[PDB]
Design a protein around this ligand. Structure first.
Ligand SMILES: O=[N+]([O-])c1ccc(O[C@H]2O[C@H](CS(=O)(=O)O)[C@@H](O)[C@H](O)[C@H]2O)cc1
Ligand SMILES: [Ca+2]
Ligand SMILES: [Ca+2]
Length: 667
């Protein structure tokens, strides 16, 4: 539905009002800015020197039988064209192209209603409903603290501009869902700011001279996500062994791994894996114990690993490793990359050395098909053929904007696109070895296409604290925001990661986090950056026993989880779901941030505060059974006892899975 008067028009798409334009209230501005983008250790400082911002108030429409073409102008020397058409699947397609490259800013307004909620924009840690705020979309480090009013954030800012803020994330994406039951996906990867704060419109700011946007509607959110994932990609099914226990994050070598494994197994903990990020060596820095970034098994630290991997596998234990797409400048791979011209370049034509925190690395130029192939062979040869069942595929958010890439695309454009590219490299390693569905890699950074190429997201680095913006809590909006952006497999470090400034992980925080992760599709621990300052999974007999209990819980859910994972693969129906996917008529479910459905039938509200013996949450109208007592409940706000090991989890009494669920209160 396109309606027009002289310099005035509206566009409806399946009855959603998308655009309105008039001389008085334009939908389009263009102009120009000079980007001053600086990075220190992945923490970006983005300044614009805005030169112009010009409202294109004149619009001349011409019509094809396949669309409308709108010439916008403000005099002869300022103009842009908007083509409105349908793409090959009938999605609404807007193509914008400014007059010339000098006009490298776009602001486009979309119509909205005050009541609309907005979800998505990738992986968001402070907000799930985005309505009422702007979100800059620039992949970076996620922040330490992430709130200017908390102390840790202030410390991290002083120390290295590292505290961040509510919108910082390693997986921003220019994709959102409206409670008008449509999504909007922007194909650009330039800097963008999605402004959701005006009651009557959404404003999308693009730092480019052109923009493509697609929209699709549906009658339910589930169908909408089916459509969104038809566009962006659907993840494979998880390997069957992911459901079989906890993956133990261990460092310090083979014997330590063995000793800890045995401690856990012998106490009855269900262990499916050992994840040893230091498989390649350790680098000590002031931040803490980091990995040596040269992607080859270090047999001095991990003697007999080649054989031990298989002995572990014989007992149902996978070995997981660590790789990122950078290479330590003081090691072999970086040298080999340098010799073949496989590294991103600086303006002088040298290889760009990035400062990563008291060491330097090259950036493997994944835009060079040869470097891409070579790096994929590194994975295949040095990890898959070694016998890894999986790995952390980390980073992807750190490309500096003054690197020069083999494909000739500006680093200011390639920066945001990097994660998906890295994801694809991993995905293809698996695909080329027949290991999709068998090997599992997990990623932190993401971008458009991570929905196809990342077999699992993890929530990156939480503080080992109970903060809303960077603690246990924040993982839930991260998971739900991703679900709404088309990625339905999400987990977090059991216990958090970031151990700085007197933050140290308590036993209590370890156990609460364990209770949370038992109700997600993957259980995996982390030592954190300072292992010896954090409570760990084997800190005492009670911790071990808690793990044996909650791993038993997790493994009981295996068939349920697997079905939910199948559904994710088949139709983009995410494993951790916002309540409104199934309780659409309940207005209260649209504003929940810290509870989710695990599958259709289990409602989870993790305790995210220290010192609680009870917990308050919302049950939508259904017949619920408390998992630990069998107690029946109906909808409305409820407070339950929530000691450690009995997280606030409820299941639908009418679930075909009810007898499985009913066995939980007997563990
Ligand atoms: O920018 N930094 O310096 C920075 C440091 C550590 C970061 O953590 C990431 O990297 C760690 C490995 S390492 O310390 O960089 O070798 C892994 O243990 C974490 O799980 C992962 O999220 C991420 C970034
Ligand atoms: Ca008219
Ligand atoms: Ca953080």
């Amino acid at each position: 539905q396109f309606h027009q008067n002289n310099d005035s028009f509206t566009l409806h798409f399946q009855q959603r009002l998308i655009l309105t334009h008039s001389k008085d209230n334009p939908c389009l501005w263009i102009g120009s800015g000079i980007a001053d983008i600086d990075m220190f250790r992945g923490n970006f400082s983005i300044k614009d020197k805005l030169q112009e911002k010009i409202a294109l108030t004149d619009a001349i429409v011409s019509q094809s039988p396949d669309g409308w073409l709108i010439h916008f102008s403000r005099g002869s020397d300022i103009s842009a064209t908007l083509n409105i058409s349908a793409d090959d699947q009938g999605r609404l397609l807007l193509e914008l192209q400014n007059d010339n490259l000098n006009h490298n800013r776009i602001w486009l307004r979309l119509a909205a209603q005050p009541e609309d909620h907005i979800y998505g924009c990738g992986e968001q840690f402070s907000y799930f409903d985005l309505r009422g705020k702007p979100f800059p979309l620039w992949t970076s480090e996620q922040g330490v603290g992430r709130n200017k009013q908390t102390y840790v954030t202030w410390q991290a800012d002083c120390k290295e501009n590292a505290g961040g803020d509510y919108y910082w994330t390693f997986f921003p994406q220019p994709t959102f869902v409206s409670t008008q039951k449509y999504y909007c996906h922007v194909d650009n990867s330039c800097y963008m700011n999605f402004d959701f704060s005006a009651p009557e419109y959404h404003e999308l700011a693009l730092w480019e001279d052109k923009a493509t946007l697609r929209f699709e509607c549906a009658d339910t959110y589930i169908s909408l996500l089916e459509k969104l994932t038809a566009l962006l990609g659907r993840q494979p099914e998880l390997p069957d062994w992911i459901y079989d226990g906890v993956t133990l994050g261990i460092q310090g070598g083979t014997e330590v791994c063995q000793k800890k494994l045995d401690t856990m197994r012998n106490a009855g903990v269900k262990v499916n894996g050992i994840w040893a990020q230091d498989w390649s060596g350790i680098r000590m820095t002031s931040f803490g114990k980091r990995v040596m970034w040269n992607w080859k098994w270090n047999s001095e630290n991990y003697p007999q690993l080649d054989s031990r991997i298989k002995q572990w596998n014989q007992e149902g234990v996978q070995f997981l490793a660590y790789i990122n797409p950078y290479v330590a400048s003081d090691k072999d791979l970086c040298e080999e990359a340098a010799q073949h011209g496989y590294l991103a370049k600086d303006a002088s034509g040298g290889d760009y050395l990035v400062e990563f925190g008291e060491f330097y690395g090259g950036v493997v130029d994944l835009t060079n098909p040869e470097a891409y192939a070579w790096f994929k062979e590194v994975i295949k040869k040095n990890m898959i053929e070694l016998g890894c069942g999986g790995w952390m595929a980390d980073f992807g958010e750190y490309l500096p904007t003054d690197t020069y890439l083999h494909n000739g695309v500006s680093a200011e454009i390639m920066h945001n696109a990097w994660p998906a590219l890295w994801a694809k490299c991993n995905y293809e390693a698996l695909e080329e070895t027949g290991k999709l569905g068998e090997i599992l890699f997990f990623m932190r950074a993401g971008s458009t296409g991570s929905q196809k190429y990342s077999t699992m997201m993890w929530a990156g680095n939480q503080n080992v604290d109970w903060s809303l913006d960077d603690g246990l809590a924040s993982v839930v909006p991260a998971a739900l925001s991703l679900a709404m952006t088309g990625h339905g497999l999400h987990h977090s470090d059991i216990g958090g990661y970031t151990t700085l400034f007197e933050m140290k992980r308590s036993k209590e925080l370890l156990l609460r986090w364990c209770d949370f992760s038992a109700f997600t599709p993957m259980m995996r621990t982390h030592e954190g950056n300072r292992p010896g300052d954090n409570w760990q999974f084997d800190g005492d007999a009670e911790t071990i026993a808690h793990f044996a209990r909650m791993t038993t819980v997790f493994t009981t859910l295996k068939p349920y989880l697997k079905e939910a994972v199948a559904l994710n693969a088949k139709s983009g129906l995410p494993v951790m779901r916002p309540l409104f996917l199934h309780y659409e008529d309940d207005a209260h479910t649209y504003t929940l941030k810290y509870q989710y459905l695990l599958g259709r039938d289990i409602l989870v509200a993790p305790v995210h505060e220290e010192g609680r013996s009870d917990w308050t949450l919302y049950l939508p109208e259904d017949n619920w059974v408390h998992a630990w007592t069998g107690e029946a409940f109906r909808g409305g706000e409820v407070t339950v006892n929530a000691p450690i090991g009995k997280p606030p989890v409820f299941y639908r009494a009418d679930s075909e899975w009810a007898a499985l669920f009913a066995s939980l209160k007997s563990i």
